[PDB]
Design a protein around this ligand. Structure first.
Ligand code: HEM
Ligand code: HEM
Ligand SMILES: Oc1cccc(O)c1O
Ligand SMILES: Oc1cccc(O)c1O
Ligand SMILES: Oc1cccc(O)c1O
Ligand SMILES: Oc1cccc(O)c1O
Ligand SMILES: [Cl-]
Ligand SMILES: [Cl-]
Ligand SMILES: [Cl-]
Ligand SMILES: [Cl-]
Ligand code: NA
Ligand code: NA
Lengths: 480, 480, 480, 480
């Protein structure tokens, strides 16, 4: 048995009645419990994430099967059997909190590894490429996909206007308008790092790397019809499914694979290996198994742990570095930036965000300083041998720059259409029919000029693709 | 034709490419356009409303048919034909911003009148009563109804635990589990002030008042099955419908009616006329037509106008005052309190929230001061005749207090069950069947002791009501 | 030896050099350490307190010498010898952080007692009365005393305009313009509760109470000349002094005394005993010794503990209640209201603000939730016997209301001049000379009409007072 | 004559009395005027600037004498007689908002030019060099200079520890410990851009540029003793002096001069021309007159205009670009980053911060959206010719990168001591005596090891300098 109390620790005499002038009179200002309780209720909410607002979290463990020391000095990958705790958040993208999990969208697949050398965030999606290749375009892309700023309803005419004028999107749309645009749930789902990263070993040798998560539950997708049937009765089915599997002991898992590519292979590929609109061939760059992640624990509080979770692609650990991918480069900035706004300057002290590794530095103060700081010395260099100092064993690599000027210019070999065609031809006939169907339903109401340009981009990917879509939309493409 | 610019007014040379070390190299920090554009994107979101997060807005006009000056000095009601601009937001209640509009919930019906003596907010719902009668319980009620804080899914076992132990909720639940718990859309929907308010005329005479909005489009409700079928294909159907009606010139309207009751009728009644779990008989207190509101304009920007809209029951105008309703009394505080958090100290300067009537006072500063203040005199009293002064013509009434002590105590004559029974018996057989069906689907999975208490509360309302529910749930109540 | 780390717990390789294109080229965006370290620096500051922005803090102990159980059930005062930890912050009032501690001002004297039944804040000043008697005037008062909103310099013409038109200020001004307006430091300084509070004993009997703190170091004040001399060489001498006394083991102490008055004595006094412009005669209501507070420990971090400290007069404990003092009533609201803005919705979790007594309630979420919440049940009533419940042993008293109606009306018996005259006559001749001298230096440049009104208000206090001021100002008041 | 009103536009009947239970009873919650007025009061303050918190603002005009089009395409410099409106803020550095203006510190000299091609901010100081050359050290340097985080008092032992271990500071300290470390006021003061910038003409030719402001009122300084004499009686003397000069029509002015250097001079010099611890010789790179800035208008409201002013070195206009200076490079980020926290995401819409030039872009939303946004198109590219587009005429230059790797490495030819010695020798004997006096007073109490290292750094600058300081401090340096 426990007393209800105020936040001052005073036991509450009456949690039912306001303080009033007699039993039916107006309410007095001197009712600290009422005002405190209502005032905190009035401040429960924080801004939702600007994208990926809808999602669900879980904790688990990553275990190494094959040590990666030949290729990276990353501590958490250094030996067979090494276990690292994770927190993972899965998500949709475009719509707000509360939106259904039956909508078409990439799915987020964000993994935080609590390593001995710091927290490493691999902020992935299910699909292995993206719509754009430069972060400067991201608020534009998002804005076109988001509900219309007047109507508050998503409008295909808007995002297809953007996408069609942004032909590098063509590969991505060829994945997203398959039925893999609606995963059945978060467990029966692919994961991808999407970007190329750099792996750096103890000799300072660098390889390019891509990451892939393969579900133990397999990949399963929903047709537009299957999605509607679920949406009718449950707008949070994926969140429900994740929690329920874990509560029942049916723990979902993913095997982590990598592809590894020499830096020098740039110059002979007909695409840029750091163009995130591109995948690498699995015949030429085979998947190499690293280990397995099992999710086995539900959070204790959704707001405190899942809503407040902060991941960033710039949370890199020794041995794992960014590539020059211009999309990734903006993400390095944007995540901690938005987090400072969404969560507070001190967001890294929220428990789910805290490292397991020691934190010692000369930062101070900021809203909601709860960590009981002490000491006189908050500056470096200083005369004190016991105060924290830099450790040169932990310098990052020095990537070679091939450019000689500060420029704003598109990458060479954009090759916007080739892999979209390859993906299209890789589909089964049943999968091609679904792609055309889903695209037709999406395009049939859009501005005729935009609809033609869409068809033309898919035609440039593959002639059969573009002709089938034109036929299905009733568009005459003879004059082109 | 216009230049894209930074926020500094510098035309942008290139809105496609980040600044990088050659065409494929990493990104430079000296890219003000990138950083400014990402950083503002990173800050787009504000907190959603703590309740009524999902909603839709429109502007229109309210026109007086019968002047109300014999009963209230309110300026906007003073003359036949007098027109006042309104802004209205409709909403659901429990789930977050992106949640479906097919869910069971009261609907918000919030009307801001831009009167010549200040803004008057009538913050109603469709349903004319509430679950609780004291604001001290509001965070409890809400927390029970909201998604479970662990699972992020709404759980009937939680809110029925609260509601069953809060028997004053019985009248409300008897309305909400009719099919009027799911209005077809926002246009074919009732509105209610819910609370008794005080109307005060130019002689200082006071009457109790209740407000009712009657839709010109009639009232239409959804069954659970009808709601699921809509939910399958559109999770924002009510938002859509409102915008669409107005864009097509099919303007929805409501007639405003009032009931008026003398203060001295308190002892004539077997309930407290200021208990918001109670309605007043329309036979004994007939509806009196006041005027008509027509919504005829969509907002120009949903975030700026609808998301940032702030209504409060305490935005009262001369002639219209709060009653002693202890629920209303807490609302007086909570709304501006939450708005200062959600929107900023200076939220009243946001255009939708601004009055038409002149604002002159000695308040100053606060985040985002955009109003070009001037002058040396920010205090009163002062020696300057031209600075703003109090105006004793605009004093409020002085309600009589019947109590002699500051107490925490439930009102007399709570009468928790009688009107719920009256409402139940007022239903058609088809309506009673839908009530029992909807209750049964909601209660069938809850804790057995809670389920029995629910049945017992409804039995106390009406024996046939409670027995039908018990039969439908398979619960044997012979022995009570 | 310790590593400098990022907030992700990654050791920093180089805390000296930004990451650049060669040894002298422009800086790269991919420099997580630079950006994290700059961004947090960029966010160190929070709003200063709206008043009492300049101050200093210390911890210590309060020990009961005489149990107060005949008069109050407060736990911390129950037993001889009982020791309660305290935190105390002393302050100036008007000017910002960084301002000098040599200025004329009341001084704040805010004591947090960490009691077994919750935190009790006694938020005092050195002077025992105040300028105003209704919180509605506080923003006016402050704005008149604050630097002019155009020039950013304090202007006697502005605050004397307010004070002269606010004749209830006369008693306060008669204390503040003695040399006690500039205490020598925080240790050699009086403290006062200012308001009457209500003490309630185990039988439910109530007495009015006033609190006084008497410095073991005695009271010492600065002349205007002494204050200038200190200001020349140290703008933070009181902060320095408090820290230095404690660091050297010379702990400052205060004895706590109370006056006690029966409720009934209202009706026979020629003032309102809950008017905070009034004192109670020490002859008629003798000081009674309660105990001693000794301050013996400096905080470990000024920002975390002293800057973030939050006190409120509404942090009352069983046995100690607010009086009807209309000034106090507004304070009850204002402090936690400003604190939610200044510090965050969760400011009560900041260590210095935490109670020693257990906190259990159904509040949740809000910015910077750091407390590891858990459990499904965040509402009451609920079916669970182990969840926190109200405890009727801890109900507050039920003060009798003498009023009939909700009114806006000045108290009866304002008696604005009589005590100011009594205070003036209680001064030694040296002390009267100082008062006139300090008043004259303040008023000599003020608007002539305001200057005359000042003289008249002091003349009404005491003829010799007003005449001496008029003489010193060169103002002939014979014609009145 | 005007009514005082609430923020809802309702006239206030009584601005004197709270609403209470009779004339002396406790206060009611239903007092919207009290609560609104106190709530807004409670929220007046925003965070002060993290440095330069104390300052003062004015408006004026800049007029071109000698057009600069041969060297820069900047619009505001394009024609003789061209006038551009400015806003200027002057400041101290280290202590908080209310701190004296008699302290030793650089002075800030921040000029916002409202040009036809956007706002251009030249965020200078009086002194023409800086303590450090990499932004990574800025939070350290500041934390060392700031009041100690335990005592809240500035401690020379802390900042000399930092500075002595940061020998690139030696030139700066040689200026700051002259009497120019305490300017007599803001008018009789030098201004400097400090950094080298790049000027780019219409043919794309680039020169390095330095900016210098020469006061028409001449340069005048205070000795330590003259500063204390002022401080005794006025802790805002420089704020007062600026406002007073302008109010009386005695407008302060500065002539702008530039120095111009070819990029190809790098190897001709024994320092890096982009090292901000360095000046350029005026013999080798003569001062060239541009024009004159006159300050002739005080702001209408200090908070709205001066306190909320936001400047950034990244507010560059076509023709004027950053150099590679690594200190500058971090400032490009830090200012808009801190301003988003201090002022809000929409701080650029605060009037003093608004450009004169048109602003059109696809940014949206954020706290306190006051700008009445409209339209459906918030993304680019789009199909609409009338929506804002990029303008390639306004591309920036493409600086040549000399580096081939991403590195963290000190510049070549740091040359930490030579210019400090040149400055020392440039001093008159009276000036040398002051410098030694001021340094001795500052160093005499610091840790002996730190004090010796200080002397050694000054000795390396000039043997006489170091020897005179050693003699004055009583330190025998014969053994070295
Ligand atoms: C209606 C009258 C008053 C109002 C509305 C008011 C309001 C405030 C506010 C808003 C603060 C800043 C609190 C914070 O930021 O944590 C403050 C601080 C303070 N006030 Fe008042 N005040 C009033 C009267 C008084 C009185 C009568 C006293 C003493 C008897 C007093 C003593 C203090 C002290 C000592 C502080 C500093 C607390 C600290 O050190 O953190 N005030 N006041
Ligand atoms: C890396 C080096 C530096 C960093 C990181 C830095 C950072 C900052 C920051 C964060 C502010 C607060 C701005 C605000 O809140 O709006 C500021 C203000 C200021 N800094 Fe710096 N600073 C640096 C070097 C300098 C230099 C070199 C100068 C002059 C050349 C200077 C002059 C100023 C001035 C004048 C202000 C006040 C502007 C105003 O009046 O509002 N700082 N600085
Ligand atoms: O952050 C994102 C924004 C838009 C689309 C995506 O798939 C995504 O992950
Ligand atoms: O504000 C609200 C909270 C909970 C239920 C409701 O119907 C409501 O309107
Ligand atoms: O909070 C306050 C405001 C004005 C004057 C004071 O003495 C005070 O404490
Ligand atoms: O921004 C700043 C920080 C520290 C010292 C300075 O001179 C400065 O301008
Ligand atoms: Cl650090
Ligand atoms: Cl006001
Ligand atoms: Cl609670
Ligand atoms: Cl944009
Ligand atoms: Na191995
Ligand atoms: Na010329």
């Amino acid at each position: 048995h426990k007393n209800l109390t105020t936040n001052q620790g005073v036991p509450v005499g009456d949690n039912q009645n306001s303080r009033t002038a007699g039993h039916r009179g107006p309410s007095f200002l001197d009712d600290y419990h009422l005002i405190e309780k209502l005032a905190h209720f009035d401040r429960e909410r924080i801004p939702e994430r600007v994208v990926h607002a809808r999602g669900a979290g879980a904790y688990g463990v990553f275990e190494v099967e094959n040590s990666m020391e030949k290729h990276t000095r990353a501590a958490f990958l250094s030996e067979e059997g090494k276990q690292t705790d994770v927190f993972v958040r899965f998500s949709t993208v475009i719509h707000p909190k509360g939106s259904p999990e039956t909508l078409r969208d990439p799915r987020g697949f964000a993994v935080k590894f609590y390593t001995e050398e710091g927290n490493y965030d691999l902020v992935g999606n299910n699909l292995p490429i993206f719509f754009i290749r430069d972060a400067l375009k991201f608020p534009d892309m998002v804005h076109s996909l988001k509900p219309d700023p007047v109507t508050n309803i998503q409008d295909p005419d808007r995002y297809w206007d953007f996408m069609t004028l942004t032909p590098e999107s063509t590969h991505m749309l060829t994945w997203l308008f398959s039925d893999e645009g609606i995963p059945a749930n978060y467990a029966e789902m692919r994961g991808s790092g999407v970007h190329t990263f750099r792996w750096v070993n103890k000799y300072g040798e660098t390889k390019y790397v891509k990451y892939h998560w393969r579900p133990s539950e397999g990949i399963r997708n929903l047709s537009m019809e299957e999605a509607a049937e679920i949406q009718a009765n449950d707008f949070q089915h994926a969140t429900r499914d994740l929690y329920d599997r874990i509560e029942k002991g049916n723990y979902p898992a993913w095997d982590l694979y990598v592809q590894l590519m020499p830096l020098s292979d740039y110059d002979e590929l007909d695409y840029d290996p750091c163009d995130p609109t591109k995948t690498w061939s699995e015949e030429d760059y085979p998947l190499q198994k690293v280990g397995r992640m099992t999710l086995n624990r539900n959070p204790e509080n959704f707001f405190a742990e899942t809503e407040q979770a902060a991941f960033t692609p710039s949370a890199l650990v020794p041995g794992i570095e960014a590539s020059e991918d211009k999309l990734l480069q903006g993400r390095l900035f944007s995540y901690p930036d938005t987090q400072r706004h969404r969560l507070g300057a001190n967001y890294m002290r929220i428990p789910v965000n805290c490292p397991y590794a020691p934190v010692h530095n000369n930062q101070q103060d900021g809203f909601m300083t709860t960590t009981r700081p002490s000491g006189h010395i908050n500056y470096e260099p200083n005369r004190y041998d016991d105060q924290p100092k830099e450790n040169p064993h932990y310098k990052e690599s020095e990537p070679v720059l091939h450019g000689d000027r500060m420029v704003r210019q598109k990458i060479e070999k954009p090759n916007d259409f080739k892999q979209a065609g390859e993906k299209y031809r890789s589909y089964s006939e049943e999968e091609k029919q679904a792609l055309i169907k889903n695209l037709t339903a999406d395009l049939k109401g859009v501005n005729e000029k935009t609809k033609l340009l869409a068809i033309c981009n898919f035609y440039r990917a593959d002639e059969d693709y573009g002709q089938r879509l034109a036929d299905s939309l009733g568009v005459d493409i003879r004059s082109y």
